[PDB]
Tab-separated table of C-alpha atoms and ligand atoms in Angstrom:
chain	number	residue	atom	x	y	z
A	1	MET	CA	110.785	83.806	126.027
A	2	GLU	CA	111.059	80.603	127.987
A	3	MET	CA	109.219	81.922	131.064
A	4	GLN	CA	106.306	83.253	128.970
A	5	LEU	CA	106.008	79.742	127.441
A	6	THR	CA	105.418	78.056	130.797
A	7	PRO	CA	101.669	77.611	130.412
A	8	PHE	CA	102.134	76.286	126.877
A	9	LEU	CA	104.668	73.713	128.140
A	10	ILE	CA	102.198	72.680	130.846
A	11	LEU	CA	99.655	72.055	128.107
A	12	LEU	CA	102.204	70.016	126.091
A	13	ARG	CA	103.142	67.959	129.120
A	14	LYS	CA	99.516	67.012	129.739
A	15	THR	CA	99.004	66.317	126.001
A	16	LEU	CA	102.060	64.073	125.897
A	17	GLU	CA	100.791	62.083	128.874
A	18	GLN	CA	97.468	61.628	127.068
A	19	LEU	CA	99.206	60.483	123.939
A	20	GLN	CA	101.466	58.071	125.738
A	21	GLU	CA	98.413	56.485	127.409
A	22	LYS	CA	97.279	55.435	123.939
A	23	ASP	CA	100.336	53.190	123.639
A	24	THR	CA	98.420	50.214	124.948
A	25	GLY	CA	100.987	47.697	123.784
A	26	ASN	CA	103.947	49.565	125.287
A	27	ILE	CA	105.809	49.588	122.007
A	28	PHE	CA	106.118	53.319	121.323
A	29	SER	CA	107.483	54.475	124.688
A	30	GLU	CA	111.190	53.822	124.241
A	31	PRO	CA	113.360	54.073	121.119
A	32	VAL	CA	113.100	51.158	118.718
A	33	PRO	CA	115.977	49.042	120.068
A	34	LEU	CA	118.847	49.031	117.595
A	35	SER	CA	120.339	45.969	119.330
A	36	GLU	CA	117.295	44.011	118.131
A	37	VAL	CA	116.482	45.965	114.972
A	38	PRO	CA	119.968	46.716	113.666
A	39	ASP	CA	118.788	47.806	110.158
A	40	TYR	CA	116.309	50.377	111.538
A	41	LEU	CA	118.337	53.479	110.661
A	42	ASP	CA	119.044	52.203	107.174
A	43	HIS	CA	115.350	52.837	106.659
A	44	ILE	CA	114.263	55.586	109.115
A	45	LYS	CA	116.024	58.921	109.190
A	46	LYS	CA	114.533	60.318	112.405
A	47	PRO	CA	113.460	57.748	115.021
A	48	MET	CA	110.926	58.888	117.521
A	49	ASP	CA	109.177	57.554	120.631
A	50	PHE	CA	107.316	58.946	123.665
A	51	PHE	CA	110.326	58.875	125.999
A	52	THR	CA	112.399	60.864	123.468
A	53	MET	CA	109.491	63.305	123.110
A	54	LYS	CA	109.444	63.787	126.915
A	55	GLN	CA	113.171	64.450	126.854
A	56	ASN	CA	112.667	66.918	124.003
A	57	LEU	CA	109.842	68.670	125.803
A	58	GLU	CA	111.903	69.133	129.013
A	59	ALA	CA	114.800	70.365	126.891
A	60	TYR	CA	112.783	73.175	125.258
A	61	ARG	CA	112.724	71.624	121.848
A	62	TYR	CA	108.957	72.215	121.439
A	63	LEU	CA	108.290	75.979	121.283
A	64	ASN	CA	105.077	75.646	119.252
A	65	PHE	CA	102.332	73.091	118.778
A	66	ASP	CA	103.307	72.114	115.265
A	67	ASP	CA	106.787	70.996	116.176
A	68	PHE	CA	105.318	68.751	118.906
A	69	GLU	CA	102.685	67.317	116.575
A	70	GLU	CA	105.359	66.642	113.937
A	71	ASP	CA	107.275	64.389	116.300
A	72	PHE	CA	104.159	62.473	117.324
A	73	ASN	CA	103.393	61.969	113.658
A	74	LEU	CA	106.869	60.425	113.187
A	75	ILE	CA	106.169	57.801	115.812
A	76	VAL	CA	103.296	56.739	113.560
A	77	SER	CA	104.763	57.252	110.126
A	78	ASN	CA	108.132	55.613	110.945
A	79	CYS	CA	106.264	52.536	112.107
A	80	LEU	CA	104.062	52.377	109.015
A	81	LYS	CA	107.131	52.792	106.839
A	82	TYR	CA	109.379	50.183	108.462
A	83	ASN	CA	106.853	47.412	109.058
A	84	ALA	CA	104.756	45.334	106.704
A	85	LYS	CA	100.985	45.881	106.819
A	86	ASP	CA	100.246	42.449	108.297
A	87	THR	CA	102.188	43.044	111.515
A	88	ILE	CA	101.340	43.897	115.048
A	89	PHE	CA	103.378	47.079	114.576
A	90	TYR	CA	101.519	48.413	111.560
A	91	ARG	CA	98.107	47.764	113.114
A	92	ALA	CA	99.218	49.360	116.349
A	93	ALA	CA	100.463	52.472	114.515
A	94	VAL	CA	97.066	52.825	112.809
A	95	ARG	CA	95.337	52.641	116.193
A	96	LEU	CA	97.760	55.226	117.578
A	97	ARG	CA	97.181	57.549	114.580
A	98	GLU	CA	93.445	57.498	115.212
A	99	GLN	CA	93.444	57.776	118.983
A	100	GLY	CA	96.361	60.130	119.235
A	101	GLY	CA	94.886	62.301	116.553
A	102	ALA	CA	91.745	62.833	118.649
A	103	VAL	CA	93.968	63.880	121.603
A	104	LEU	CA	95.852	66.356	119.440
A	105	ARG	CA	92.740	67.913	117.960
A	106	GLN	CA	91.433	68.723	121.411
A	107	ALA	CA	94.788	69.907	122.682
A	108	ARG	CA	95.322	72.207	119.679
A	109	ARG	CA	91.999	73.902	120.514
A	110	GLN	CA	93.180	74.525	123.989
A	111	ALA	CA	96.520	75.886	122.745
A	112	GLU	CA	94.631	78.314	120.486
A	113	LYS	CA	92.977	79.748	123.621
A	114	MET	CA	96.568	80.789	124.637
B	1	5XF	C1	112.549	45.457	123.446
B	1	5XF	O1	112.216	45.055	122.095
B	1	5XF	C2	112.588	43.821	121.609
B	1	5XF	C3	113.135	42.828	122.468
B	1	5XF	C4	113.516	41.609	121.916
B	1	5XF	C5	113.369	41.322	120.591
B	1	5XF	C6	112.843	42.300	119.732
B	1	5XF	C7	112.458	43.563	120.212
B	1	5XF	C8	111.906	44.495	119.235
B	1	5XF	O2	111.891	44.196	118.048
B	1	5XF	N1	111.391	45.664	119.698
B	1	5XF	C9	110.725	46.624	118.929
B	1	5XF	C10	110.655	46.734	117.523
B	1	5XF	C11	109.949	47.733	116.937
B	1	5XF	C12	109.292	48.671	117.681
B	1	5XF	C13	109.318	48.617	119.046
B	1	5XF	C14	110.034	47.599	119.707
B	1	5XF	N2	110.022	47.583	121.090
B	1	5XF	C15	110.037	48.769	121.947
B	1	5XF	C16	109.914	48.243	123.381
B	1	5XF	C17	109.194	46.976	123.201
B	1	5XF	C18	109.111	46.660	121.750
B	1	5XF	N3	108.671	49.527	116.815
B	1	5XF	C19	107.794	50.668	117.141
B	1	5XF	C20	108.942	49.121	115.584
B	1	5XF	O3	108.522	49.670	114.559
B	1	5XF	N4	109.729	48.054	115.632
B	1	5XF	C21	110.209	47.305	114.480
């Protein structure tokens, strides 16, 4: 149940903070702004960002590690999909994939101890 999951959610909260710290350009920490990118949903079926992941975490939407990891991976893959390779966005998503992936590998090991 939800109370039994408390330590797991504590682990996710810490992991999310570590992931969000990898957003050195501050471009993955709010939804892509549809006022400035009005075609974004034409292209991307499930937007994701670190603020939305925090909201999801606090709303009990992540009950296992895979579901959490899936949403992080969308932050990356949506950005690679929407943007051309020779963009600040694409390069930033590659950096995030690498650095965030290291965070997740360590965090998954700690989750396995639970
Ligand atoms: C606040 O963002 C903007 C303000 C003025 C003009 C343009 C933008 C803008 O394009 N923001 C933006 C585009 C993104 C994007 C993120 C942004 N924002 C998010 C907050 C600052 C930049 N990602 C991850 C993308 O893949 N795209 C295409």
